[PDB]
Amino acid sequence: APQQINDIVHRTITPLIEQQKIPGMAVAVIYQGKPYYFTWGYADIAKKQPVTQQTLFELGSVSKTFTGVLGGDAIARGEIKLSDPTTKYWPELTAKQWNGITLLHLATYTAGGLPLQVPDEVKSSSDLLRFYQNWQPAWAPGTQRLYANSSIGLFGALAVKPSGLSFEQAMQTRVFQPLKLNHTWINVPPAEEKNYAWGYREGKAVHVSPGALDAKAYGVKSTIEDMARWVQSNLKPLDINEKTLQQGIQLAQSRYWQTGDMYQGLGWEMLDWPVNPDSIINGSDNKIALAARPVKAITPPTPAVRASWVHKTGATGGFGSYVAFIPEKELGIVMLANKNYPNPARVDAAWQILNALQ
């Protein structure tokens, strides 16, 4: 890599790893639209397996960006509309509190306080229907943003219903394959198991536990190379050949709601560039990022703004991930670690690097 990139990355991520006791880390920096790769430590400590360009990490909530784009793609295909009632695509969801809750609300966490997690006890298809049928909103639809796996999770599940594909097949054939993300998986196949990093929590090797809607909200695993390609694709959608996927990526960066200085896209969250770093760093703290916030509708949504900081934090029990990019500058970063460490540390490190190269 050019010396300026090596310099800032080494000065920033290397000490971060030391400070946070991260066993293994892969970083990609996209600079002038080209990817550069950096690796530290071990994917599996016991086996002394190094992190490589082939190592799969749990993306955790970064998976919501895939779900948003896939939803975007279904919109572009004319299969769904964000303006449609949730019930249009789940006619079994008949309970009265669902009147007026649309796919937009589900996708953008604005349905009225759907919970952060689907409860652990919810397993089966029947458990899930029961859960949503009994759920009572804290607020009217389209008034408050409460970040929620149960919200975007349901969006993903419903977005694929008209296609008649499973969520996994739709994701693979409409998003992963066209973008040649060949080592990106919702379900890691046996052939990839040797490349699947262990996460570490309290010193113990762990993988994400299965859960209802996992695939839609937090279940994707990917390598630093595929994630760099994911950044390139989101940086430059209009270079994608599949017309609906091109549009889908664009739609996921539309600004639907504003709270403070942030705007909610589909999976992606965005701020105007230049940003105040303290705003994204402080705002990434879960005490803020997971709290209810009043939203103002953007009526109608603002199309993808090139001069934006576009980003998403992701974690599982044993992993912490971050993706940030600025379309105007052709500049991006991906940070994948097999320890879950605090969000502001990730955002601060990413800011230092991108601000240095911008």
Q: Please report, as ranges, the residues that interact with a second copy according to CB under 8 A.
A: 75-76, 78, 81-83, 102, 104, 238, 243, 246-247, 250-251, 254, 256, 297-303, 305-307
Closest CB to a second copy among residues 304, 333: 304
Taking the complex as a whole, the smallest distance from the CB of residue 149 to a second copy amounts, in Å, to 23
Taking the complex as a whole, the smallest distance from the CB of residue 325 to a second copy amounts, in Å, to 16
Closest CB to a second copy among residues 163, 250: 250
C-alpha 117/C-alpha 131 separation (Å) is: 11
Give φ, ψ of 315 to 5 degrees: -145, 155
Task: Mention every residue, 6+ apart, whose C-beta is less than 8 A from residue 318.
Answer: 58, 198, 199, 200, 201, 205, 206, 207, 208, 338, 339, 340
Taking the complex as a whole, the smallest distance from the CB of residue 245 to a second copy amounts, in Å, to 11
| Residue 187 counted as an annotated binding residue | no
How many Cβ atoms sit within 10 Å of the Cβ of residue 65?
Answer: 26
Name residue, tokens 């993706």.
Answer: 323
| Residue 149 counted as an annotated binding residue | yes
How many Cβ atoms sit within 10 Å of the Cβ of residue 298?
Answer: 14
Name the 3-class secondary structure at 293. strand
Taking the complex as a whole, the smallest distance from the CB of residue 305 to a second copy amounts, in Å, to 5
Name the 3-class secondary structure at 139. coil
| Residue 209 counted as an annotated binding residue | no
Active site residue 233: no
Give φ, ψ of 114 to 5 degrees: -55, 140
C-alpha 30/C-alpha 164 separation (Å) is: 36
Is 314:61 a contact under the CB 8 Å cutoff?
yes
Select from 254, 218, 260, 275 the least CA-distant residue to 59: 218
Tokens of 59: 């993306």
Is 175:167 a contact under the CB 8 Å cutoff?
no
Taking the complex as a whole, the smallest distance from the CB of residue 125 to a second copy amounts, in Å, to 29
Taking the complex as a whole, the smallest distance from the CB of residue 36 to a second copy amounts, in Å, to 26
**Out of 61, 63, 151, 321, which one is annotated catalytic?**
61
Closest CB to a second copy among residues 201, 236: 236
Please compute Rg for the chain using Cα positions: 19
| Residue 340 counted as an annotated binding residue | yes
Select from 219, 224, 220, 239 the least CA-distant residue to 179: 239
| Residue 19 counted as an annotated binding residue | no
Closest CB to a second copy among residues 73, 225: 73
| Residue 61 counted as an annotated binding residue | yes
Closest CB to a second copy among residues 127, 272: 272
C-alpha 149/C-alpha 109 separation (Å) is: 9
Element (H, E) at 221: strand 221-222
Closest CB to a second copy among residues 81, 204: 81
Which positions are catalytic? Answer: 61
Binding site feature residues for a beta-lactam: 61, 117, 147, 149, 315, 340
